[PDB]
Amino acid sequence: NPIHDRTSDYHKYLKVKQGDSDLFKLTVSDKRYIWYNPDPKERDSYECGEIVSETSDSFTFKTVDGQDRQVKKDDANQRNPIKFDGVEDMSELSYLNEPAVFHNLRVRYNQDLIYTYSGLFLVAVNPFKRIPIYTQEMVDIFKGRRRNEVAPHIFAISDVAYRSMLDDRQNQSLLITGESGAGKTENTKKVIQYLASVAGRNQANGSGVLEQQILQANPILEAFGNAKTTRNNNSSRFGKFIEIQFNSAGFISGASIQSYLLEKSRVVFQSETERNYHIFYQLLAGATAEEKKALHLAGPESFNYLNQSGCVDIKGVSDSEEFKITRQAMDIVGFSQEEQMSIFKIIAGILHLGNIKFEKGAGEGAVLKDKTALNAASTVFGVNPSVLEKALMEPRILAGRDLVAQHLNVEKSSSSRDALVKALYGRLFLWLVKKINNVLCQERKAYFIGVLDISGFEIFKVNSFEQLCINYTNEKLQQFFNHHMFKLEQEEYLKEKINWTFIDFGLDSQATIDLIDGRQPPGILALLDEQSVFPNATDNTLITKLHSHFSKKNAKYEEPRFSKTEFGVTHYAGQVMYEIQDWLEKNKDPLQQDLELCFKDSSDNVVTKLFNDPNIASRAKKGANFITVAAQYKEQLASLMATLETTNPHFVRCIIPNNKQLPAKLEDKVVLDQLRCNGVLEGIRITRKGFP
């Protein structure tokens, strides 16, 4: 049993190192310690001090320099017996408090133990380096093993959900929380590898045909769905709910991917030092000189969609290599060779579209002096350049019932070009996901385990509509933790009359949630939608309206005095200032119909499907108008949350060590902020003072 063999890799990489004769002596000491703040200003910077004396209501302890300090016993953060240092489940700690909890995660983290239980759920501190704890060898250890029987691991909570699914015959869900960069996607890939292995077929041929395809779907979506942001070199710029499906027997019958809220503005814009989607750099770097020639490609610095941020490389990543990986994954999944080259036709097409330079004509209307990029794009898309040209600068609209040809100025033409690009990319992504799902959908399930991997809470210097939707989602996920851990739990206790005193854990994001998606009174998304369908609305009337409804009326809202285009939302993870520029158009998400009539005619079999498939090209109507991005998203989310509620949820709290993407650098302020807003200690408390 490698578990019991102190020389195994299991003990080496997943267990706390044996202490020595000098640590034993410290461990049996009778002295008592307290966590304190040398600088009261810096409440998260702690030092250890020895308790030197005590009165009935206080402790007197010695600081590190040597000074003596008094504190009330009620405000004292006592240090646990150091035999607790490194303990695998912090519900076992005698003193549950912020420095004690952080300290324990520190001790474990200092020896590359990134997993720690926190009562009913798992905590995972991002190591920002590789640790050899996800081999098939490690997988096999956790099989069938009970949580208390093995060390904290993501494999272990995965196992627990599996058994619970088989024993209770109830669908399960793995909810992995975290801010951007914390580790949600890595752990997500782990849950699936472990479910695929312990539950994959095992005698010939299928066994990990399906299983392997399930596996190969992620690298597909990461190349198209992930990019470098200032907070994570592999940021997930779309959310996903993965259904891993099983039969009554417990074998994998299939899997389903639901995608959410792809950041299509990334394709046309990138803040400084960020990148566009990985796929763009992979192609330009991984294509043969031949395809390079067929797709009229050249270096990233030659494309407008790629040469603005000042970054085209990710340290330690080789795009040309990831290109090979994406391709092999598409082959496994089943992307025909014709389909694959259409896909990069779209990718190269998008790049040429971005190179189009609109100029002012004699009139205020725009002209296209150089048709080079126009013709190149037309060429790879399989569309008529002059139709596309007219569609871009002179689109036709209805004025009443009349048919009026417009002539957009430079600005408008560029925005329209950008709209095309974003529709192409987003429809493509939706198509890739559709195609994957056919492949993994080949049998009615009896049960499933759902893994939720969303875009995590983020803050940039500039926060737009995309970030509101991201942070609102993160706020609902946190509320789902609150609900289940504290609310649903005590509701039983009071229900089953065990006597029982209700406790308020002070965790509730409802006011923030309501401020955003409230219907009556109307919240931010609702006012947005209103303005969005108001013929005379501007970004300026929108913010004014927001201020009018919430400023000095909603406790979670702030009208800043330093700007007239931003508003602050107080989220669980902190206050975020949002810039109102472009929200109306972002919400409306418009595309000129002449553009679509121009692509519906393409000769490419992939492109044609992006503009004729009702499931990709059609838009629901909210009466006289098309549904908005906001109304649509709010609807897709509510459905996900309703589905979650019909599962047994397992929470993994992912935690970022610092804001630098660095290993071996656990910063207390950063970590403690997360522990607080995540509700980790409260989580341990409910578990301890309760009846699970």
Give the binding site for Mg ion (CB under 5 A): 185, 236
Do residues 255 and 440 make contact, with C-beta atoms less than 8 angstroms apart?
yes
Do residues 661 and 232 make contact, with C-beta atoms less than 8 angstroms apart?
yes
- Judge whether 184 is annotated as a binding position: yes
CA 331 to chain centre: 27
For the packed helices 524-532 and 539-550, what is the interaxial angle rounded to 10 degrees?
Answer: 150
Q: How many CB atoms lie within 10 A of CB 630?
A: 25
Tell me how many degrees the CA angle 688-689-692 measures, rounded to the nearest 5: 70
Q: Tell the smallest beta-carbon distance from residue 236 to Mg ion (Å).
A: 3
Q: Which is nearer to Mg ion, 185 or 647 (CB)?
A: 185
Q: Which is nearer to Mg ion, 185 or 245 (CB)?
A: 185
| Residues marked as catalytic | 180-181, 185, 232, 235-236, 456, 458
Residue closest to Mg ion when measured from CB atoms = 236
Q: Which is nearer to Mg ion, 380 or 654 (CB)?
A: 654
DSSP β-bridge partners for residue 648: 172
Q: Tell the smallest beta-carbon distance from residue 178 to Mg ion (Å).
A: 8
Q: Tell the smallest beta-carbon distance from residue 455 to Mg ion (Å).
A: 7
Q: Tell the smallest beta-carbon distance from residue 183 to Mg ion (Å).
A: 8
Task: Kindly report each contact of residues 307-310 with a partner whose C-beta sits within 8 Å and lies 24 or more positions away, as own/partner.
Answer: 308/269, 308/270, 309/270, 309/271, 309/272, 309/273, 309/274, 309/275, 310/272, 310/273
- Judge whether 182 is annotated as a binding position: yes
Tell me which residue of 224, 15, 23 sits closest to 108, measured CA to CA: 15
**In what helix (H) or strand (E) does residue 349 lie, and over which residues does it extend?**
helix 337-353
Q: Which is nearer to Mg ion, 354 or 456 (CB)?
A: 456
Q: Which is nearer to Mg ion, 185 or 378 (CB)?
A: 185
Structure tokens at 69: 């300090």
- Judge whether 178 is annotated as a binding position: yes
- Rg, Å, the chain Cα set: 28
Q: How many CB atoms lie within 10 A of CB 497?
A: 7
Tell me which residue of 310, 305, 309, 312 sits closest to 414, measured CA to CA: 305
DSSP β-bridge partners for residue 177: 653
Q: Tell the smallest beta-carbon distance from residue 250 to Mg ion (Å).
A: 29
Q: Which is nearer to Mg ion, 176 or 485 (CB)?
A: 176
- Judge whether 183 is annotated as a binding position: yes
Q: What distance separates the 2 farthest-apart alpha carbons in the chain?
A: 91
- Judge whether 179 is annotated as a binding position: yes
Alpha-carbon torsion (624, 628, 634, 640), positive or negative: positive
Q: Tell the smallest beta-carbon distance from residue 244 to Mg ion (Å).
A: 18
Q: Tell the smallest beta-carbon distance from residue 579 to Mg ion (Å).
A: 24
Residues 6 or more apart whose Cβ sits within 8 Å of residue 229: 180, 235, 237, 271, 274, 458, 460
Q: Parallel, antiparallel, or unpaired: how do β-strands 447-453 and 172-177 relate?
A: parallel
Do residues 410 and 359 make contact, with C-beta atoms less than 8 angstroms apart?
yes
Q: Tell the smallest beta-carbon distance from residue 182 to Mg ion (Å).
A: 9
The C-alpha atoms of residue 294 and residue 542 are separated, in whole angstroms, by 46
Residues annotated in the binding site for ATP, as ranges?
Answer: 178-185
Residues annotated in the binding site, as ranges?
Answer: 178-185
